[PDB]
Structures are given as C-alpha cells and as structure tokens.
Amino acid sequence: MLDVGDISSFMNSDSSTLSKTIQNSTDSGRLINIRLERLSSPLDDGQVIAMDKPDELLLTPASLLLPAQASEVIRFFYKGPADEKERYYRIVWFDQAARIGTILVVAPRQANYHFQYANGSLTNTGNATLRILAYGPCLKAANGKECKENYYLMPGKSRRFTRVDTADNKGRVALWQGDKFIPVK
C-alpha cells in the first residue's frame, strides 16, 4: 500500500493548518488524487454530511505524481467556524502505481478539555476528543510480558481498558488534551 502517515490526524484548537508527509516506498512512481468529505462522526456508524462552505477544509496538492522512493508534503487548511463544535473529515486518497480513507479531526476552536477517571473507567466530560492510553502488565498473561492500549475517546463517551491491567499498581493511564500530555494514573 501507500504510506499516508497517521490514520487519524488532529488539528488542535490553537491551529488551523496541518501537514502530512506521504512516502512512496516502491520502485514505481504513483498518480495520487486526494479528496475531502465531512463526516457526522469518525465512527463506523457515521455518515458524510455537507461542509457549510466549500472552503471549510481545503488541501494542497490535490493531485500529484509521486515518483519512486520519494516523499511529499500535503497541507490542510480549516476555514470553518471558530466555535465549541468538533468537526470530522475523511481524507480520501486515490493511488495508481487503491482507494484509502483516513481521518482528520478539527478540535473545537473554543476547546473545553475535561475528563473523569473513576472505577477504572475514563470518561470524556469536555467538548473535544481525547487520545487515551494505558501501558503496563497484561491482564491475560496469554497476551505476553507487556501491554498497551490506545483509543480516541469522543465527548461524552467512556472507556475501560481491557488488555492492560490498570488495577495493578504498575498499570498506567494517561491521555492527550490536544498537545498537552496528561499523566492520569
């Protein structure tokens, strides 16, 4: 396949622009087209919805010839409202030596980051998605000597960790509020 970088990218509230590097690691050059769709949500039961205006989210370049064993920067620009709402977009990449879909999250310009860790459950009690993670011993020793989990936690949703043993005092929880890393436990 083609290397697009992160499968979900985050434009945090102090930022309206973002770059992704794409690498073509094969002998062939490639004809890439790139397209954007807003989404009701980033989840599987989400659906494409309309941008309020066609300059809400723009990228360059939308077409390029990427030669063999070479990389290029694609830039993304947000010009929609600066409000308390988080927005979700799909980046659709067409590849010719494959149609791959990745996620862009525009965190609310008016961010209110909050969370609760109670009874082993993380709950997002703010208005912007959190990137949550645990690391430490495994719950089922069938899974091995070290365990980690990584998830996106949308506003209002909860998550228990199911691989890492967070009840053991060597099990750790932390999360990202935009660009700030917060040691939860």
Numbering used by the authors: 0 to 96, 115 to 202
Relevant lines from the article:
The major class of these adhesive pili (or fimbriae) is assembled via the classical, alternative and archaic chaperone-usher (CU) pathways. The biogenesis of CU fibres requires a periplasmic chaperone and outer membrane assembly platform termed the usher.
We next crystallized free EcpB and determined its structure using I-SIRAS phasing to 2.4 Å resolution. As expected, the superposition revealed that EcpB is structurally more related to CsuC (Z-score = 14.2) than classical chaperones (e.g. Caf1M, Z-score = 12.0). No topological differences were found in D1 between EcpB and CsuC, but both possess an additional strand D1 that is absent in the classical chaperones. Domain 2 of EcpB does not possess helix 1, common in classical chaperones, or helices 1 and 2, characteristic for archaic chaperones. Instead, it has a short helix located in a long loop between β-strands C2 and D2. The C2-D2 loop is flanked with a pair of conserved cysteines (170 and 179), which form a disulphide bond that is not seen in classical chaperones.
